[PDB]
Design goal:
Structural class of chain B: mainly alpha
Bound molecules: calcium ion
Radius of gyration of chain A: 16 Å
Largest interface: A-B, 36 and 16 residues
Distance between the termini of chain B: 29 Å
Number of helices of chain A: 8
Protein name (chain B): Voltage-dependent L-type calcium channel subunit alpha-1C
Subcellular location (chain B): Cell membrane; Cell membrane, Sarcolemma; Perikaryon; Postsynaptic density membrane
Family (chain B): Belongs to the calcium channel alpha-1 subunit (TC 1.A.1.11) family. CACNA1C subfamily.
Shape of chain A: globular
CATH class of the domain at 4-76 in chain A: Mainly Alpha
Largest sheet of chain A: 2 strands, antiparallel
CATH topology of the domain at 4-76 in chain A: Recoverin, domain 1
CATH superfamily of the domain at 4-76 in chain A: EF-hand
Organism (chain B): Homo sapiens
Distance between the termini of chain A: 20 Å
Helix content of chain A: 55-70%
Family (chain A): Belongs to the calmodulin family.
Number of helices of chain B: 1
Order of helices and strands of chain A: HEHHEHHHHH
Number of strands of chain A: 2
Order of helices and strands of chain B: H
Radius of gyration of chain B: 9 Å
Structural class of chain A: mainly alpha
Oligomer: heterodimer
Number of strands of chain B: 0
CATH architecture of the domain at 4-76 in chain A: Orthogonal Bundle
Chain lengths: ~140, ~20
């Protein structure tokens, strides 16, 4: 059901949110990462994000809780609704296009260590119509 | 939600790096 590689990739996502590396995601850490990803959620919006996943109730998300939600979302969310949500993270100004500059910001934000050239290559590979940027449909074709 | 979208994005970067 879950290989070690899938588990470590789910840990890579968990680690981004648990910035102090103590095995727990707090609101403060959830708030910090969500703001770096363009968003700006409400203080209530952060405690019920934490809440919907914190299954034992200690007010915090450990990796077993996280791995349980990710395994369920992987089985429940449809493949198209999946990417739409990711696109909206990339398309930081909501104009319907992911530019190289927008992709660069997410790459640096998620601690990736890519060259400006490599990001350009990433855009090149998904750009199907040649306008130098990535729309929603182009994103789904690469992501699947 | 926002947790799974983040996984999807890190996978996109992963897939590219293998090329
Ligand atoms: Ca922590
Ligand atoms: Ca907990
Ligand atoms: Ca845009
Ligand atoms: Ca395009």
């Amino acid at each position: 059901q879950l290989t070690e590689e899938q588990i470590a990739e789910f840990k890579e996502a968990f680690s981004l949110f648990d910035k102090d590396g103590d095995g727990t995601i707090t609101t403060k850490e959830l708030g910090t990462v969500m703001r770096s990803l363009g968003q700006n959620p409400t203080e209530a919006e952060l405690q019920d994000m934490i809440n919907e996943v914190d299954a034992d109730g200690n007010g915090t998300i450990d990796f077993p809780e996280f791995l349980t939600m990710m395994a369920r979302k992987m089985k429940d969310t449809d493949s198209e609704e999946e990417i739409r949500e990711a696109f909206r993270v990339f398309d930081k100004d909501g104009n319907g296009y992911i530019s190289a500059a927008e992709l660069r910001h997410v790459m640096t934000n998620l601690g990736e260590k890519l060259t400006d050239e490599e990001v350009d290559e990433m855009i090149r590979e998904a750009d199907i119509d040649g306008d130098g940027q990535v729309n929603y449909e182009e994103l789904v074709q690469m992501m699947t | 939600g926002k947790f799974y979208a983040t996984f999807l994005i890190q996978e996109y970067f992963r897939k590219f790096k293998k090329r």
